[PDB]
Amino acid sequence: GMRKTLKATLAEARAQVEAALKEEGFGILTEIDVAATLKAKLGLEKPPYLILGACNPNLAARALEALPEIGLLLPCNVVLREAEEGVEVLIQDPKEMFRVLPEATQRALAPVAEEARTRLSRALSRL
Amino acid sequence: GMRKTLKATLAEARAQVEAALKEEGFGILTEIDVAATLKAKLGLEKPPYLILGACNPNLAARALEALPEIGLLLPCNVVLREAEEGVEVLIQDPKEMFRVLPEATQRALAPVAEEARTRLSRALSRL
Ligand SMILES: O=S([O-])[O-]
Numbered sequence: 527g528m529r530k531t532l533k534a535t536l537a538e539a540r541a542q543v544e545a546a547l548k549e550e551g552f553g554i555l556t557e558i559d560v561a562a563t564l565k566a567k568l569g570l571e572k573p574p575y576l577i578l579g580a581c582n583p584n585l586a587a588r589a590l591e592a593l594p595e596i597g598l599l600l601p602c603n604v605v606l607r608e609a610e611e612g613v614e615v616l617i618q619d620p621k622e623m624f625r626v627l628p629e630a631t632q633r634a635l636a637p638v639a640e641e642a643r644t645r646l647s648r649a650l651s652r653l
Numbered sequence: 654g655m656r657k658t659l660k661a662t663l664a665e666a667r668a669q670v671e672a673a674l675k676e677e678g679f680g681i682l683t684e685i686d687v688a689a690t691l692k693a694k695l696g697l698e699k700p701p702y703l704i705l706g707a708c709n710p711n712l713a714a715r716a717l718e719a720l721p722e723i724g725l726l727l728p729c730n731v732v733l734r735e736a737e738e739g740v741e742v743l744i745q746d747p748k749e750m751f752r753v754l755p756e757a758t759q760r761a762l763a764p765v766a767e768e769a770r771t772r773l774s775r776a777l778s779r780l
Contacts, residue, residue, distance in 0.1 A: 553694075555685050556684075556685060556706065558682050558683060558728065560717070560724060563682065563710065564713075564714055568710050568714060570714060575717075575724060577724045577725075577727065579706070581685075581690075583694035586687075586691070587695060587699070590687065595656075597687060597702065598743055598745045599745075600704060600730075601685065603726070605724040605725055607724070616724075616725055617725075618726075625752070626749050
């Protein structure tokens, strides 16, 4: 949806992502190293793949105040994975993620999802 | 969907939900204290609210083979929140989550989602 490949090492891509997100009000709350946890649990050897859970507290608080169960679809995931041409960054589109909800609830959340999507697409565009 | 209210405290509910998930092959990879992070960032007191990222490594590994970009949807969120009549546990239903995905990936993903959902609803039933 929002996808970009960077010619950058993993650590470089990850620092540039954290920095572009922080410019737009999104902090990183969680991180899962998917290759390291598949190794530890299953003995599998997979290429680099991280999932970062990023969040703007103001937009999150607003969404959770309107619809408390919306925590099931937070935070916004950012994937960084090894690609041929370097590291691919993928960012969850909030508008797309709210489509699991009834249409009336998506209307009720639209201003927040739009604001989040605009800040996220801005971060991506600066990578 | 998938919710139960526990006549219990938040730490009784957390110790308990983690035990019931473990029984069903789901471990907790991440956790966000929503009330403490919104207080920290925004200065507002909010009611107890936790987001636990639960994962079964074998099911996640197969999901990632069907669709490499499914890391944007993982792991499976479990909410514990102060509710009206106790602490409400909500579990993201894998079947609903996958609906956001391209039509083309749905059939291949259906049996991993069915297996996840049966394990989760089992864990929820034992609380
Ligand atoms: O960071 S403030 O702009 O939500």
